[PDB]
Amino acid sequence: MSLWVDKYRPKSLNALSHNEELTNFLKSLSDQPRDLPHLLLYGPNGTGKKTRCMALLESIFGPGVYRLKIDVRQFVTASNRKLELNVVSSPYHLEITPSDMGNNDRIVIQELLKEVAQMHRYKCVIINEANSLTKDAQAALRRTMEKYSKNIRLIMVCDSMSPIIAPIKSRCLLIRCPAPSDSEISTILSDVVTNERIQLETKDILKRIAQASNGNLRVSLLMLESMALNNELALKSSSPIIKPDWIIVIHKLTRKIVKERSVNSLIECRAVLYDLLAHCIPANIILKELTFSLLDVETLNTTNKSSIIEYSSVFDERLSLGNKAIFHLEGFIAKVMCCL
Amino acid sequence: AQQPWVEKYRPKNLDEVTAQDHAVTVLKKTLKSANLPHMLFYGPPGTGKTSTILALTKELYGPDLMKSRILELNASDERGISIVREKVKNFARLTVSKPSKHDLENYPCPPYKIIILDEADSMTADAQSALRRTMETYSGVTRFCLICNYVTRIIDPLASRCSKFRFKALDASNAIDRLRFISEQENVKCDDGVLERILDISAGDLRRGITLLQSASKGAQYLGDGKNITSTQVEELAGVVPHDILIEIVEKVKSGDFDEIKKYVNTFMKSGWSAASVVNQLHEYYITNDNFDTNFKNQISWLLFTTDSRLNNGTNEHIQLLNLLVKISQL
Amino acid sequence: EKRSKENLPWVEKYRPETLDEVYGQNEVITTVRKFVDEGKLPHLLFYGPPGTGKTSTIVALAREIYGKNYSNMVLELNASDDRGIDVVRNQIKDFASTRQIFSKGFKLIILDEADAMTNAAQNALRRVIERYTKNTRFCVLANYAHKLTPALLSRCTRFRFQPLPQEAIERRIANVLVHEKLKLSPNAEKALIELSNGDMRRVLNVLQSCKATLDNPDEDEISDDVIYECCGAPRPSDLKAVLKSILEDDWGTAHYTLNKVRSAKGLALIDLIEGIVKILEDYELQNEETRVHLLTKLADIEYSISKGGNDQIQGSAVIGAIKASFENET
Amino acid sequence: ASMLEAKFEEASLFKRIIDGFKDCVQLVNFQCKEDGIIAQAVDDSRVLLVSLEIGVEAFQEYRCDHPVTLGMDLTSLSKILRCGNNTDTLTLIADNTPDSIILLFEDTKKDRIAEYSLKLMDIDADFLKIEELQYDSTLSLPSSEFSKIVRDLSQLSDSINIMITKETIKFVADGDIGSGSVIIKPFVDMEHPETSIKLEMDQPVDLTFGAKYLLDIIKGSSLSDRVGIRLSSEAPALFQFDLKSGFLQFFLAPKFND
Amino acid sequence: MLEAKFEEASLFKRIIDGFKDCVQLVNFQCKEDGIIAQAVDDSRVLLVSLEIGVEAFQEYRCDHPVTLGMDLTSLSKILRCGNNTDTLTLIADNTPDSIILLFEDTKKDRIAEYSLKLMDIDADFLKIEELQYDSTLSLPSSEFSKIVRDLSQLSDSINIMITKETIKFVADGDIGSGSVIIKPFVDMEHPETSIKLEMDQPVDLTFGAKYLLDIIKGSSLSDRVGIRLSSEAPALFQFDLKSGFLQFFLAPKF
Amino acid sequence: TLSLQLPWVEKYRPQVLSDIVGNKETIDRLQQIAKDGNMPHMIISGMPGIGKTTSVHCLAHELLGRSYADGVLELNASDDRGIDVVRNQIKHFAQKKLHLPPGKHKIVILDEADSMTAGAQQALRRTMELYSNSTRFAFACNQSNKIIEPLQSRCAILRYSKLSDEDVLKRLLQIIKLEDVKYTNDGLEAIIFTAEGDMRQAINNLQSTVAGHGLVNADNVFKIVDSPHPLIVKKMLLASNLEDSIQILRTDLWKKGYSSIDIVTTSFRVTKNLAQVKESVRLEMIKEIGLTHMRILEGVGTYLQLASMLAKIHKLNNKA
DNA sequence: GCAGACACTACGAGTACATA
DNA sequence: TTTATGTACTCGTAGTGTCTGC
Numbered sequence A: 001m002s003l004w005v006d007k008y009r010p011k012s013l014n015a016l017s018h019n020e021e022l023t024n025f026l027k028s029l030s031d032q033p034r035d036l037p038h039l040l041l042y043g044p045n046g047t048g049k050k051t052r053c054m055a056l057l058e059s060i061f062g063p064g065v066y067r068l069k070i071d072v073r074q075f076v077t078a079s080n081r082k083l084e085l086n087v088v089s090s091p092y093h094l095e096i097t098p099s100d101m102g103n104n105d106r107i108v109i110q111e112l113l114k115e116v117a118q119m120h121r122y123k124c125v126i127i128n129e130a131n132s133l134t135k136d137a138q139a140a141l142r143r144t145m146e147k148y149s150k151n152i153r154l155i156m157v158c159d160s161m162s163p164i165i166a167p168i169k170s171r172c173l174l175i176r177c178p179a180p181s182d183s184e185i186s187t188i189l190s191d192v193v194t195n196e197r198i199q200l201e202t203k204d205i206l207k208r209i210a211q212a213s214n215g216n217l218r219v220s221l222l223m224l225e226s227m228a229l230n231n232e233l234a235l236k237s238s239s240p241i242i243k244p245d246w247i248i249v250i251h252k253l254t255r256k257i258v259k260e261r262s263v264n265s266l267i268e269c270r271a272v273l274y275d276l277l278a279h280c281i282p283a284n285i286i287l288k289e290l291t292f293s294l295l296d297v298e299t300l301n302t303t304n305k306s307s308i309i310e311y312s313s314v315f316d317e318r319l320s321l322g323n324k325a326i327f328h329l330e331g332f333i334a335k336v337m338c339c340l
Numbered sequence B: 001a002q003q004p005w006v007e008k009y010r011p012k013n014l015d016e017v018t019a020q021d022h023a024v025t026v027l028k029k030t031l032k033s034a035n036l037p038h039m040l041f042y043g044p045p046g047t048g049k050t051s052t053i054l055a056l057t058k059e060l061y062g063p064d065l066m067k068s069r070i071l072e073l074n075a076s077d078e079r080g081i082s083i084v085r086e087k088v089k090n091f092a093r094l095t096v097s098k099p100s101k102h103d104l105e106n107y108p109c110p111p112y113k114i115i116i117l118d119e120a121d122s123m124t125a126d127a128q129s130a131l132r133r134t135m136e137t138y139s140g141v142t143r144f145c146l147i148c149n150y151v152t153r154i155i156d157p158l159a160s161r162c163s164k165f166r167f168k169a170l171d172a173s174n175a176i177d178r179l180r181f182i183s184e185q186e187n188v189k190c191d192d193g194v195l196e197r198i199l200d201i202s203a204g205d206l207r208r209g210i211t212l213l214q215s216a217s218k219g220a221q222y223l224g225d226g227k228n229i230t231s232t233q234v235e236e237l238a239g240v241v242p243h244d245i246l247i248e249i250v251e252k253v254k255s256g257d258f259d260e261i262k263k264y265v266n267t268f269m270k271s272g273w274s275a276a277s278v279v280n281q282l283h284e285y286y287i288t289n290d291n292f293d294t295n296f297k298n299q300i301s302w303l304l305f306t307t308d309s310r311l312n313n314g315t316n317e318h319i320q321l322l323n324l325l326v327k328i329s330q331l
Numbered sequence C: 001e002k003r004s005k006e007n008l009p010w011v012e013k014y015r016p017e018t019l020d021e022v023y024g025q026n027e028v029i030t031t032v033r034k035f036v037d038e039g040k041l042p043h044l045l046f047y048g049p050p051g052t053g054k055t056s057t058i059v060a061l062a063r064e065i066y067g068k069n070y071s072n073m074v075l076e077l078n079a080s081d082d083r084g085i086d087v088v089r090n091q092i093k094d095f096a097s098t099r100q101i102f103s104k105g106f107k108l109i110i111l112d113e114a115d116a117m118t119n120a121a122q123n124a125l126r127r128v129i130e131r132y133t134k135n136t137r138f139c140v141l142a143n144y145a146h147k148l149t150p151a152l153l154s155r156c157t158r159f160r161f162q163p164l165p166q167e168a169i170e171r172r173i174a175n176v177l178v179h180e181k182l183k184l185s186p187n188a189e190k191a192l193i194e195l196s197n198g199d200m201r202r203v204l205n206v207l208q209s210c211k212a213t214l215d216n217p218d219e220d221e222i223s224d225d226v227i228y229e230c231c232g233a234p235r236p237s238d239l240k241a242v243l244k245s246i247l248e249d250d251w252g253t254a255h256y257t258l259n260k261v262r263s264a265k266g267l268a269l270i271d272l273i274e275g276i277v278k279i280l281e282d283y284e285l286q287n288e289e290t291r292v293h294l295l296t297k298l299a300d301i302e303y304s305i306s307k308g309g310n311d312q313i314q315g316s317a318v319i320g321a322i323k324a325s326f327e328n329e330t
Numbered sequence D: 001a002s003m004l005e006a007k008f009e010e011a012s013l014f015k016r017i018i019d020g021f022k023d024c025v026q027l028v029n030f031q032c033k034e035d036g037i038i039a040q041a042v043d044d045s046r047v048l049l050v051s052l053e054i055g056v057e058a059f060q061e062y063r064c065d066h067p068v069t070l071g072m073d074l075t076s077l078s079k080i081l082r083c084g085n086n087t088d089t090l091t092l093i094a095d096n097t098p099d100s101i102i103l104l105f106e107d108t109k110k111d112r113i114a115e116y117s118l119k120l121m122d123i124d125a126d127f128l129k130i131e132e133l134q135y136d137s138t139l140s141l142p143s144s145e146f147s148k149i150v151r152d153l154s155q156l157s158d159s160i161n162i163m164i165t166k167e168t169i170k171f172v173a174d175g176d177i178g179s180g181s182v183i184i185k186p187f188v189d190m191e192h193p194e195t196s197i198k199l200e201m202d203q204p205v206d207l208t209f210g211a212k213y214l215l216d217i218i219k220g221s222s223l224s225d226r227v228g229i230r231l232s233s234e235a236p237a238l239f240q241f242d243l244k245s246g247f248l249q250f251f252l253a254p255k256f257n258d
Numbered sequence E: 001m002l003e004a005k006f007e008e009a010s011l012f013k014r015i016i017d018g019f020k021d022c023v024q025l026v027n028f029q030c031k032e033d034g035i036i037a038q039a040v041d042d043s044r045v046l047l048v049s050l051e052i053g054v055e056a057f058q059e060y061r062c063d064h065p066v067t068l069g070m071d072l073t074s075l076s077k078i079l080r081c082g083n084n085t086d087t088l089t090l091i092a093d094n095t096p097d098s099i100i101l102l103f104e105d106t107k108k109d110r111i112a113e114y115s116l117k118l119m120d121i122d123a124d125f126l127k128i129e130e131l132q133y134d135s136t137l138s139l140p141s142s143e144f145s146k147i148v149r150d151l152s153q154l155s156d157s158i159n160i161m162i163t164k165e166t167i168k169f170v171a172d173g174d175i176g177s178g179s180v181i182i183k184p185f186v187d188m189e190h191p192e193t194s195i196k197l198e199m200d201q202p203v204d205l206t207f208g209a210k211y212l213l214d215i216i217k218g219s220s221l222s223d224r225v226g227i228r229l230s231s232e233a234p235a236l237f238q239f240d241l242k243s244g245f246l247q248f249f250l251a252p253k254f
Numbered sequence F: 001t002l003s004l005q006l007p008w009v010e011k012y013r014p015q016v017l018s019d020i021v022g023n024k025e026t027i028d029r030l031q032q033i034a035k036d037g038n039m040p041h042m043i044i045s046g047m048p049g050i051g052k053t054t055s056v057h058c059l060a061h062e063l064l065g066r067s068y069a070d071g072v073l074e075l076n077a078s079d080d081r082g083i084d085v086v087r088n089q090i091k092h093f094a095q096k097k098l099h100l101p102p103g104k105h106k107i108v109i110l111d112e113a114d115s116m117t118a119g120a121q122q123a124l125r126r127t128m129e130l131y132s133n134s135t136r137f138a139f140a141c142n143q144s145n146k147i148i149e150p151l152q153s154r155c156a157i158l159r160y161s162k163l164s165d166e167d168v169l170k171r172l173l174q175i176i177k178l179e180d181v182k183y184t185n186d187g188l189e190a191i192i193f194t195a196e197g198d199m200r201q202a203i204n205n206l207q208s209t210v211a212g213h214g215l216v217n218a219d220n221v222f223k224i225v226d227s228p229h230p231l232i233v234k235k236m237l238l239a240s241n242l243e244d245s246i247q248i249l250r251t252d253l254w255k256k257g258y259s260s261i262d263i264v265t266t267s268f269r270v271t272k273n274l275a276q277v278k279e280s281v282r283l284e285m286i287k288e289i290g291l292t293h294m295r296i297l298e299g300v301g302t303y304l305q306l307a308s309m310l311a312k313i314h315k316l317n318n319k320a
Numbered sequence G: 001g002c003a004g005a006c007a008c009t010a011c012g013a014g015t016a017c018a019t020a
Numbered sequence H: 001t002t003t004a005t006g007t008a009c010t011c012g013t014a015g016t017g018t019c020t021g022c
């Protein structure tokens, strides 16, 4: 595909040279497929956890695991509310995601695992974005994965595994996937630019991409593609760093909060927050980015920074215990401006 | 076999259940009689509630009458008020199944059937209220056995009726024999203190210890060097933060300089460490240390407790860890 | 049931079949007996904590009023049975309307655990209560009185089942040992009283489990060791030692003592905390702020424990909370 | 050999008895002894009782070594009875300490034997024997006429008042949309003795009954062609439907009057 | 260019009554040799195929094969209008967006002409998989209907097992269990009512109760139903007609 | 089985409008309607037990002494008050031809109309607007907020009020003169204080005390009926000196077998209806009691949670 | 006798409220 | 487009059984 992030993807453990110890551990797991416990890969987002999962699946089952077939399924919920979710099936395994409505995913995960559990010997199941499951769904998944073990195996992919309940973490073998280093990102981007055709003259731009990505391979590749098509396939040593529009508007909101403290500024911040929430960004990441942009302002004193981070923790807990996702952010911004 | 060591080494009878001597002894002495009460098994995950109830089921009846005289309801099937009002009551009202002659020869089949209810804490209040009088009325022909990790979710009438058997957390003193038996049976070479470290890493979670031991054995097999497992290998597999990074964290905290702490926390979150283990190690380093006075420990215990409570309710690990380190720095 | 008695739990193998056998409740039982002997029986409402003897009292009362065939002469509607407003409009209606099929006396309707009913059901039931009260009486058993409509409370006479005192539990224990040919120690009896918390079902369960614990049911006695081992409860000596180490000794020794006490017999943190709270109530505290700090911090501790988490951090939090609360000049 | 071996001729019989009180009663029990399969159950509302007795005459071959109790759910039992044809012959088969019975549907016309099993149940209702023997009015009228009367009087109201006088039987069903008064007098039909109505009046009777339960009573009018009502004050009404060997007698509690 | 004049509309009436509930939308791919149609349910588990030859029709003339996508509720209403002694005359035009169902009676007292439009339904994939079936039995349709109804009362999964010339329809549920066995009875005076089995290899197949109850509605077509089973191929319940037949294809559900 | 005596609630139920004692203006208006005859549609509302449905029944009896059994329809929540039954029955009753006296109309009494469905009330609106010169409706609900606005528009709202202690005392002395019983003035004052304006509660307490002891004395009354939990909870909340509130709780609510949920809900109601303290402290106290209510409902029901709620309340009271 | 024509109970699906 | 179980109500629906008359 025209995107360089997806078609520059390793297909086997041999191609993965990112982490020697993690690859050795995965090879150790793949040596004997007969006794394979349930996996749970955790770590920062975008480091390539799904790449490791697919490489391990190919190392265990064999080839053809990338021959994904988009099969659609129908579900029955309360009243007439009908949900249609397509399962990204494949030979030798199966992929499922909580892309359905958040409150009702228990029945879907329940009947998918019950159906696949009926029919090398086992069929793996990959659950992407597992931290987004409701706690009741994980409770249902617990006994489902415990009862059937000879038939089903779960490779459960999640970042920031704190919302995962204790029993699930108990019965899942935990694997840590550290974020890419600057050297690894630079090497991967050098491989990409060498395989492709970009007029590059200085290695400093690649390291600037690595610094700006914050250990995010996918975001680094998207940045490289974006400013490569922008710069007519000729990177310049003084090329400005392009950032997502969400980052730009979050920074603009941060400067607005810093420079002025008024109720009219608060209603403008409310309008901006409503726009961002309508732009489909999770409120947790919005709060984290707003807090980390506020702390980076040099005008703020250390006491203000401590108060900001304390209120940020409190309102992050409230966001995890809330369902409106806008009231908590508005309260956090009001508390921050009161502190400032 | 072709199963993970957790499923392969699950206890079969009540004798294999290590620790939990009170509950196992009570159940084994109840086996001779027929005075089995409504049970409420509870405790930390991995302590062996399901293993104990399955062993008791196998011991009372045998592999023939289990399918006929046992009903189990997990969260894998719906447990609302209607299903408890209809299916559970229908099963309770039914007469006991007819034992075979062989079962009467070999097993002491009691004149009742056991209704296991795993994860009874996930039931609603109305379902439990409906279950109360069904439990109390048809108790002459059936026995209920609630299993839950939290007693508080259970309403107090069910806690009153059901006999409570707390399952103690398994540590390096109680479950060392089970891990030693597993290691000797699976032919895994390890140092003197490897199993103690495995049981210390887990918190009453012997299943997690078995998984860690199996992963270490798989790594040793892949290396093929014929070398005993060291504590560092199990430490790295378990997700345990190395002590040098913890010392660096403490050095950053002691020096103040909020910006430096923030940068180090960003790098630490890049490293991918789970915040729960970091908070646990910070507690184990700060409380046990003798270089801090009483007031510092008094404040830091509450700080760590608040961070742990906030991390229990999901939340972003980055912000919680940064706030904890900032508050400890200001101490 | 099946295979007669002696295959039942001690909770229900010892059930009061006579109003004389109901211990602990004296005013309630005497007033109810005077009501039925004089001939006037108002709409009864039994309210109290679980295990006090409410449904046992009403079943014994129905047996005394009617006889050995009370089961089909009364209409007991549980939350296990359906109790929608359709049930109120049909079954309660025609049971109150019709005459008795086996005798000439009145109709008794026992709405056991009636707090778990829809407000519409209670509204429909209040007119049934008020209409056919000439020759039909309603009895309502409710653990919580806040789930009942105020009109439904207005129609019924309020009876409160207090938690069982020491003497009643001691007498029931004595009768249980008499029937079971089992011996007990006075200290173990006191431990059973303390573990009761006004709940005889807990006492019966602990007695059954402790008899099961003994290798020989005969020629043996239950001391405090058997009770505390089988119940998994902290001993008073262990709680006092832990509290003394926390209040007097430094952090390292107090932490070591608490960890050793917990690991000696697998003591749960929640039970130790409840014991500490119970002991600290008897303490005389000059500063009011110390009480506030203790209560608030400890309450947060059991809330977090109930939500689950790490036990080491919570134990250290308990030690820190006690020390910091007692630091401000007691 | 199964200890309980009861054979039914014209298996539509047992279906008719089951349908006689399937609607009013949901849970029954069958005390099977050497004399016959008796039953007795009380509704959920504790208003209507259904006694039952089937003698050894109704069975082709009956053998019950020990007393057996078969607590049953009538809905499932009626469903099982509906799983067959009247031509087939039904057999109840139960072993020692039964968990379920075996129902056989055999016929020599075509070998299509169908074996059904119905799970038993622990009702644990000891009840008591009938302690009513003296009644004031003892009347017998054809089942079709009584069922028709109850049917057209239940639409007017919910209470049906049966009054007994000197050779005069009166049904009053005053309601919201109107009233009703059915007066039937005794007469002996020589041509059709089955259509005759008899009366035996000792003391005057004035009792009201619920409409729904009386409809449940008359739902059993297909079981027998004649029903004998035995009314008395301070006593439940006894609607007895005679069988070839036993009877299906109901006990209905009159409504209170104030 | 279609003129299919029946001698009795009751044939078409009982055919559509046979497939009211199994499928709602059908494409009539009428040909010279007769009318054939293939239909798949919404669940994609039940397949119904009908075939009526010219021998049944009193008259028939179809020069050009035309695929007719037509509603079944409207046909049910129009054919409930019809009754005995009336000869239904299916008439279509060269480009028949609307169909004509002339009802011709013996007498000229009342002759009715009706219409119905043709909706757009895509032509179903004509799969012609005819894999051999292990066992073959044919029993009267009334007996099979009674057996399946009584066994579907008990449970929602009827097992069909054939061994030693004894078909054992077993359905196990919650209220109890149900087992009926059929011996290969042969009848001389009434050859229509008989049970004959061709057991080449034993099979053990389980089917859902809903589809097994749905396929009964075609019992009015034939007094006998022929069932042939294979361990992996879908079961074939075939209803004999005067000219052709109507068949049900249901895959086993283990 | 022994027989039962008729309870004093309906053994002395009033039958004449002069018997009921309460709002004097309301009863005089009812008597005026009784004498005149032209009864308008009325919606009687008020607290439970203060004599709402008995006044309606007495008024209907006085208006239709001879035709009560024919021209008065009584429906309540015990009947199938749904759209089909309301339509059929009320339309059959409102069109029935009954020759009442010239000043007398048919009366359709709807006890406890608060729990009646919206569509049924919508049908009732149309029925009232058609048939008003032959039949007149009469509702009796605890709260009139449930009844839709047009029904109140086409009716005559008549609200009752809680009886003063003088009227309850007068009725109690009337019943005591009716049936012989020995009483002490302290016992009667205790009964009135426990009743809190509820006449039915006073009658039930008096009957229970007489049956239990035979003498209406303060000790006997307090033995039969305990002190109401709102009063002890209000004493707990209003009292300062945290230890005193803690011991009041542990003595009068914990050892007396009151559930924690009941204590928390009673505290919420008391602090909502409290008037001695200012608004801000009430709001904070509601916030803290609500946090404790959330903890209790989540499952953590112990004595220490209530003690912590009291501690937070007292820390609020002393202004930190 | 068989097929309809009816009224009947029963099942399914959708809206509405949930503390005074 | 929101909540998210349980309850109650209301409706139209499909079978189910009983009475008339070709």
Ligand SMILES: Nc1ncnc2c1ncn2[C@@H]1O[C@H](COP(=O)(O)OP(=O)(O)OP(O)(O)=S)[C@@H](O)[C@H]1O
Binding pocket: A167, A170, B005, B006, B007, B009, B010, B011, B016, B017, B018, B019, B020, B044, B045, B046, B047, B048, B049, B050, B051, B052, B149, B178, B206, B207, B210
């Ligand atoms: N006391 C014990 N003795 C021996 N093995 C044990 C014991 N407790 C746990 N295990 C091991 O743990 C695994 C089974 O754990 P479980 O019995 O399911 O624990 P649990 O009580 O079910 O925790 P949950 O249900 O997941 S919260 C097997 O590998 C057992 O060998």
Ligand SMILES: Nc1ncnc2c1ncn2[C@@H]1O[C@H](COP(=O)(O)OP(=O)(O)OP(O)(O)=S)[C@@H](O)[C@H]1O
Binding pocket: B157, B160, C010, C011, C012, C014, C015, C016, C021, C022, C023, C024, C025, C049, C050, C051, C052, C053, C054, C055, C056, C057, C143, C168, C172, C200, C201, C204
């Ligand atoms: N006063 C008492 N005297 C003797 N035994 C008692 C007494 N109170 C309770 N018990 C015992 O407690 C058992 C259960 O108590 P019950 O009276 O059946 O239930 P309850 O006390 O009403 O509590 P709930 O609210 O119904 S769960 C009885 O079977 C007795 O063995």
Ligand SMILES: Nc1ncnc2c1ncn2[C@@H]1O[C@H](COP(=O)(O)OP(=O)(O)OP(O)(O)=S)[C@@H](O)[C@H]1O
Binding pocket: C151, C154, F008, F009, F010, F012, F013, F014, F019, F020, F021, F022, F047, F048, F049, F050, F051, F052, F053, F054, F055, F141, F142, F171, F199, F200, F203
């Ligand atoms: N003003 C009064 N005078 C005399 N007796 C009264 C008076 N008010 C109430 N009562 C008594 O209270 C009882 C009647 O109460 P009701 O009127 O039925 O209560 P209510 O007003 O209907 O309130 P709810 O909503 O139905 S609980 C009888 O015992 C009456 O004697």
Ligand SMILES: Nc1ncnc2c1ncn2[C@@H]1O[C@H](COP(=O)(O)OP(=O)(O)O)[C@@H](O)[C@H]1O
Binding pocket: A004, A005, A006, A008, A009, A010, A015, A016, A017, A018, A044, A045, A046, A047, A048, A049, A050, A051, A052, A188, A217, A218, A221
């Ligand atoms: N060893 C490697 N060499 C080169 N690229 C890699 C390697 N590992 C991962 N990647 C990159 O990671 C990207 C996929 O990341 P992804 O699996 O989507 O992360 P996540 O699992 O966190 O969503 C691919 O575009 C691929 O180029």
Ligand SMILES: [Mg+2]
Binding pocket: B049, B050, B118, B147
């Ligand atoms: Mg378990």
Ligand SMILES: [Mg+2]
Binding pocket: C054, C055, C056, C112, C113, C141
């Ligand atoms: Mg009870």
Ligand SMILES: [Mg+2]
Binding pocket: F052, F053, F111, F112, F140
């Ligand atoms: Mg009223």
